[PDB]
């Protein structure tokens, strides 16, 4: 089980002992369970959830009919969490109160999208010399293979292309503050993506 929120900024906490903690905050408007999938009906155990606010003209009849089974009046997106053995009713409401302090938490967002990057900014390649007579190959890559053998480029070769908007998961980030009144997690460090991007928070996979 986890929670769906939004990257609401990047802040700092000063402690009394004098250390500023790098903080991003994740505002989590109370999620609402939509469908509870069991093995008897779906093969695996999971719970659909929905983070609120979607205008009626943007909700389709099929989508609107699904929020209607669960009396939810649901908003933007639907997300699913693989459960081990938890039981959620299909009208319940999961909040930040599912996390405490300390707590190591993994955060998965959509990384910030760099357009089409080169081999230097995408794969950390070393640029060639800028003057010792170098021709027009300043940041172009070097050779892409050996010679007649293998006589082709191998699959996976590191080249340039969409460096960017990819699902990225940051793990083991400590939870410095759980605010159930303003519906906030304050997480120590950086989380992937831009401000307001939808972001998934759940218990650390490595403990």
């Amino acid at each position: 089980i986890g929670v769906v929120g939004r990257k609401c900024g990047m802040t700092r906490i000063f402690t009394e002992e004098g250390v500023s903690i790098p903080v991003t905050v994740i505002e989590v408007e109370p999620n609402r369970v939509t469908q509870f999938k069991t093995e008897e009906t779906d093969g695996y155990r999971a719970v659909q959830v929905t983070a609120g606010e979607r205008r009626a003209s943007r909700v389709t009849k099929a989508q609107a009919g699904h929020f209607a089974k669960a009396n939810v009046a649901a908003g933007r997106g639907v997300w699913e969490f693989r459960l081990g053995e938890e039981q959620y009713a299909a009208g319940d409401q999961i909040t930040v109160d599912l996390f405490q302090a300390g707590q190591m938490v993994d955060v998965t967002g959509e990384s910030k999208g760099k357009g089409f990057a080169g081999t230097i900014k995408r794969w950390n390649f070393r640029g060639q010399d800028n003057t010792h007579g170098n021709s027009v190959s300043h940041r172009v890559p070097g050779s892409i293979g050996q010679c007649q053998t293998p006589g082709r480029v191998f699959k996976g070769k590191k080249m340039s292309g969409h460096l960017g908007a990819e699902r990225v998961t940051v793990q083991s980030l400590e939870i410095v503050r759980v605010d159930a009144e303003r519906n906030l997690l304050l997480v120590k460090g950086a989380v992937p993506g831009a401000t307001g991007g939808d972001v998934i928070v759940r218990p650390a996979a490595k403990a």
Binding site: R12, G18, V19, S20
Partner: protein, 120 residues
């Protein structure tokens, strides 16, 4: 100082006036050394009679950088000039006086002799 070929003043008492880093010690491809780190120097310039001579491969602790050192609140402390304190093979200072300030990142178990002599 920070890297090799870098040239840096001498904050302790006797011998050199300028030393040049010829190796940053520590790791393997290690490329930088800040305050509290151990470099390998050579003596580029020295006084007429002192405990070191010009042209001598020695070891020195970095005490005072222009890149600076950062505190836990986020604050930085940043100096105008690069400076080291030369050491022996005990990694104990050779001179008996320290000139200029140092930082509190240097009052560890090995370098508190430099701190206790410094007019910080």
């Amino acid at each position: 100082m920070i890297q090799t070929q870098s040239m840096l003043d001498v904050a302790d008492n006797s011998g050199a006036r300028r030393v040049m880093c010829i190796k940053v010690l520590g790791g393997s491809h290690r490329r930088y050394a800040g305050i509290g780190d151990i470099i390998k120097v050579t003596v580029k310039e020295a006084i007429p009679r002192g405990k070191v001579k010009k042209g001598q491969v020695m070891t020195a602790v970095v005490v005072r950088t222009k890149h600076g050192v950062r505190r836990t609140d986020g604050s930085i402390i940043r100096f105008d000039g690069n400076a080291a304190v030369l050491l022996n093979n005990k990694q104990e200072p050779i001179g008996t006086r320290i000139f200029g300030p140092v930082t509190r990142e240097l009052r560890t178990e090995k370098f508190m002799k430099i701190v206790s002599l410094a007019p910080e």
